[model samples]
Target: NLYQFKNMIECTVPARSWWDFADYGCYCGGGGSGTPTDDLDRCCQVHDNCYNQAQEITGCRPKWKTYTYQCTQGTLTCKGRNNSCAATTCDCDRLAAICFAGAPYNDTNYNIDLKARCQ
Candidate 1:
């Protein structure tokens, strides 16, 4: 289980059992590192920022709520820690082209998949 308090983050397991802890760093457009046992929440927020930025750029209403599922359980392992802090850039040319087309353009039509467009 995970417990958060103040500036510190902690994970605990029952007696006679063992669990691994990993920290995926913080990433916005740019990246930074923290432990899952430590920086879990920040990483989650950064992930959300990418999605929100994509929506903002395309004028789309948010399709998904931001949550910490990525930092939970099996998803929070350390294998990808080195790549966690990588910065992501989104190419808006296609969106711009569509937006330039005129009044018929709408958020729903121009909505971008942030995970695919921003990397």
Candidate 2:
């Protein structure tokens, strides 16, 4: 089993490696579009989709180290809970790093104004 927050959960995403080549970065879980297959593929697909969405909303890329969708026996793994994305380490892009470091929630809110207006 895993822990869940009643009201809200405070998440602290650790920084990992980065990828300058790929369009997006890495995530703990696997990535996909909900097309289920074997265990490993399923995990990687889910991981990829989640990371992709995160990249879309945040307009940032995933870290290089955690970007691969392969399910390494012991090297790569995720402690899944509630079948959703949560606190996981990622090598955030410059803007995301700035947000986590000190950028206000209001500042980071995914709004057109924020995305377009804020610097």
Candidate 3:
């Protein structure tokens, strides 16, 4: 059931691993185009100078554990690709979601669904 789209459709492909978003660029709903500049105090406090990418899933794929991290001001940033959302300043506290485990965007155990003010 491969559906071909004349125009690319914007959708969130949940990240499967930590290196997943870093390497493969798995699609997510938020994280609009632009460099993330705001320093998430809470995130950084949890893991100094550390940052994480989040994703959203609505169904069953794999048994995974989501992980998340944070960065200081002007730390996290990204450029848009594959009809994905444009990158924007990511707030670590607000950017909470599922964090996967490995590269090629397919690994579990690092997954985490954050429960916070914005989550």
**For each candidate, how many residue pairs have backbone atoms clashing (under 3 Å)?**
2, 21, 21
TM-score of each: 0.21, 0.26, 0.15
* Model 1 segments more than 4 A misplaced: 1-37, 59-119
Per-residue lDDT tens digits of candidate 3, residues 5-66? 00011112222222333212112222322222222222223221222322222321111222
Cα-based lDDT at residue 104, candidate 1 = 28
> For residues 13-119, what per-residue lDDT tens digits would candidate 1 score against the true structure?
22211111122223222333333112332433444454456555333433322212122441222222222121111112112212222212122323233444334
**Which of 1 and 2 is the better model by TM-score?**
2
**Which residue pairs in candidate 1 collide?**
23-35, 23-36
Which lDDT tens digits does candidate 2 get at residues 43-91?
3344455456655544244432232121233222233431222323231
Off by over 4 Å in 2: 1-34, 63-119
Once model 3 is optimally superposed onto the true structure by TM-score, how far is the C-alpha of residue 49 displaced, in angstroms?
A: 16
Off by over 4 Å in 3: 1-41, 44-55, 58-76, 82-119
lDDT of each: 0.27, 0.28, 0.23
lDDT of 2 at 54: 58
lDDT score of residue 67 within candidate 2: 26
